[PDB]
Amino acid sequence: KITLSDLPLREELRVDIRLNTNENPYPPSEALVADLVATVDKIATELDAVELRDELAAYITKQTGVAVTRDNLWAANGSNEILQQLLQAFGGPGRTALGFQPSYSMHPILAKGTHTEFIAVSRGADFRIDMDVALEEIRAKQPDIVFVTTPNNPTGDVTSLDDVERIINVAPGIVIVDEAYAEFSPSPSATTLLEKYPTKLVVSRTMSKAFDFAGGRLGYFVANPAFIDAVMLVRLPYHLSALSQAAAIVALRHSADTLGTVEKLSVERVRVAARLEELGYAVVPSESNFVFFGDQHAAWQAFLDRGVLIRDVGIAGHLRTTIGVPEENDAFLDAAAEIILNLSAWS
Amino acid sequence: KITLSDLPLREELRVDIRLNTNENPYPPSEALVADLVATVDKIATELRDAVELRDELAAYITKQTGVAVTRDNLWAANGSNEILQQLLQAFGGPGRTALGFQPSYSMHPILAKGTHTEFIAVSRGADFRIDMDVALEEIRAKQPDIVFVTTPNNPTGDVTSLDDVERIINVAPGIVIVDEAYAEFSPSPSATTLLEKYPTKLVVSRTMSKAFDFAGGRLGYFVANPAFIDAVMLVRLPYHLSALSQAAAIVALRHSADTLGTVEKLSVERVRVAARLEELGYAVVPSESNFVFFGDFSDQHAAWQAFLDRGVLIRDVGIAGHLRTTIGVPEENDAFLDAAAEIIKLNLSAWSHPQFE
Structure with missing residues (x-):
């Protein structure tokens, strides 16, 4: 039974509230x-x-x-x-x-x-x-x-x-x-x-x-x-x-109703960012449907333990939360307040 | 006027009865x-x-x-x-x-x-x-x-x-x-x-x-x-x-069974269309698709025009002497065979003007 190594491949080719994908x-x-x-x-x-x-x-x-x-x-x-x-x-x-x-x-x-x-x-x-x-x-x-x-x-x-x-x-x-x-x-x-x-x-x-x-x-x-x-x-x-x-x-042809919801998402971003800064998080000024914050994979686990899936984009010290409906947004803000410490890196 | 030559393009890149696309x-x-x-x-x-x-x-x-x-x-x-x-x-x-x-x-x-x-x-x-x-x-x-x-x-x-x-x-x-x-x-x-x-x-x-x-x-x-x-x-x-x-x-x-019935019907109709083209005197390549490839036309684009004049769109695939008709419903298939019959005795020619630089 055969593996990828056997094929003539080009050699250079060898839970409940989810705020992790940037969607409406x-x-x-x-x-x-x-x-x-x-x-x-x-x-x-x-x-x-x-x-x-x-x-x-x-x-x-x-x-x-x-x-x-x-x-x-x-x-x-x-x-x-x-x-x-x-x-x-x-x-x-x-x-x-x-x-x-x-x-x-x-x-x-x-x-x-x-x-x-x-x-x-x-x-x-x-x-x-x-x-x-x-x-x-x-x-x-x-x-x-x-x-x-x-x-x-x-x-x-x-x-x-x-x-x-x-x-x-x-x-x-x-x-x-x-x-x-x-x-x-x-x-x-x-x-x-x-x-x-x-x-x-x-x-x-x-x-x-x-x-x-x-x-x-x-x-x-x-x-x-x-x-x-x-x-x-x-x-x-x-x-x-x-x-x-x-x-x-x-x-x-129904974009008018879509643009109403993005307005609602944009207002909610401004809020979530402000509140994160109150809590003491460093937040990059955003104009997207997400926030990038922190000063991390441990933190990511913390949020998940509280039923909140955000994104670890593999960037040191920071995590990305996509803006959702307000209840989702508060549920995120709850977890983040309490989520604020060191810990070492092993090989 | 701005054009494609102004862009940094990779240099090597520089009617009613239609039997012309091979669909059901x-x-x-x-x-x-x-x-x-x-x-x-x-x-x-x-x-x-x-x-x-x-x-x-x-x-x-x-x-x-x-x-x-x-x-x-x-x-x-x-x-x-x-x-x-x-x-x-x-x-x-x-x-x-x-x-x-x-x-x-x-x-x-x-x-x-x-x-x-x-x-x-x-x-x-x-x-x-x-x-x-x-x-x-x-x-x-x-x-x-x-x-x-x-x-x-x-x-x-x-x-x-x-x-x-x-x-x-x-x-x-x-x-x-x-x-x-x-x-x-x-x-x-x-x-x-x-x-x-x-x-x-x-x-x-x-x-x-x-x-x-x-x-x-x-x-x-x-x-x-x-x-x-x-x-x-x-x-x-x-x-x-x-x-x-x-x-x-x-x-x-999940509705394939219905689809397979219609392909059966298209396949039976192909055998018919092909046989009848050969009766009319056309050379037909033996096929097992939903189309037939036929002719030995003198000017096949001319032939293609003839069919279209009679309200029948088939395909000119740019292969000398031949045209491709895709099999349709039987009425369409007879409408094609009619025109095919009329066309096989004409000495169609329709040369184009050549390329002026």
Whole structure:
């Protein structure tokens, strides 16, 4: 009986209240569900994602205030797939992508699958991008792709558009601004910078943190139309099924009810962060649906013992709690107050 | 005007009766639709690696092929292209090659470009079957890391025997992907029967999108030794397949019995359409898919226009002298055969203007 070692693999490849995944805990609207079931019924009975892209452009126009059309919009099965496609067109063998740590956007499987070398530059002690290092490294390394995540995961930190523009101007290739968590932030979108940096800027977005549509998922990006032409050369034909498209379309036409719940999540974040600081925790200012706090795996166990699952992102001294409904949020705040000591590391 | 040349692109990247896409034209069962809407409602209201879908796919394949498999032999992705991409990422890629037999639709050029696998093509013989001497010679010569065999083949409809497949496997040094996208319509046994014997080499690729119809869901999958699931797990995008996509595929699978009845009906109709084309005087490649590949036209695009003029959309696959008609409902099939009859005595020609620079 055979193991992986026997196959010709490429050699380089050798409980109750859960606030640990960064998703919208609120139930979907009756009108959403109703539209969903009626749309599947119609599609189930049988009579490049143009319609979905119209809808995504509409959603972004109203969300960001930047007027875009389907020509600026590109959809895939998820954010990882959006990024894969961009790395295939603009990264890959002999090319590099540079990002700022800690970040969840540059998943290692993307490098391996696309053969793009990933370069990491540490954020500063405040978990914010250190602009002097950032611009020096980009100028040193001439990376083909620069990633900026804002708001950042796991830290929640936003980077100003002025700083983003700085990064774009020194960046020789493309820049992917990852706004997965942008819905929860009051700050303006980098979509406002597209007109000025058409050959460079791609704004990456997702429906999977704010929306909830029968377990649908959708990653998308906003860019100059030429970027759509580019990823069309690498995208898998019929990558996006009619079903996936339809269901994303339904979610997007009920986005008004979705944006009400993200408003509620955003207000609750401000609260949870403040209270953590009262309790004496050091909390990175956030504009996401989560908080990054501490000064840890032991602490993570403590919370779990009290029936509260948050996330250990493997970053020393800190843990990430995603904002939930208020009862969940208080239940978290209870555990955290009492969770505040040393203990040594063995081999 | 800003264009694609202004971006830092990788330099190598620089009517009524439609019988032209190879899908099942029959309506879904009321029970299917009912289950689908109830499932989505349940999932929509909100109470690791597609394990449940894979249990159900394994059950399907066990019944269909007769070869006993579990979820550990089964791997699911959004479609066949995605299944192939993942395999090429694990087993192909920079410095490696994949060899196929033309004409075939399985090795899409975008797969080569996205994965950086070099594709090699070997021509099928004058009968549109794999010419085994040339096949085995070229595998020997090239030592390709991946060999593709599509059976039934698209666009030709031709099946390759398991004996010939085994010959190909034994000379192939890397892996062999047998693409059985169209297998449901064929009476011949599945290469899943060969899995036990060739665990380190053989992957059988399958899809639901030709036979099933489930709210515009799509689902590609493969059947193999469990070690192959371990392999593609290293390259697959986490959460590549949505709960929704999985759910819907599971509903289609639990109503398979209804779907298999409609494929039976499509398969009987194929035998008819093919025979009648041969009566009319058309040369028809023996098929076991849901389509027929026929002609010896002078200008086959002209012929394609003729059919369309008569309200019948078939497919021009850009192969000289031939066109591909996918089998539909019997009325559609007769409507096709009518036009086919009229067309076989015309001396159609419709040259285009040439390329002005």
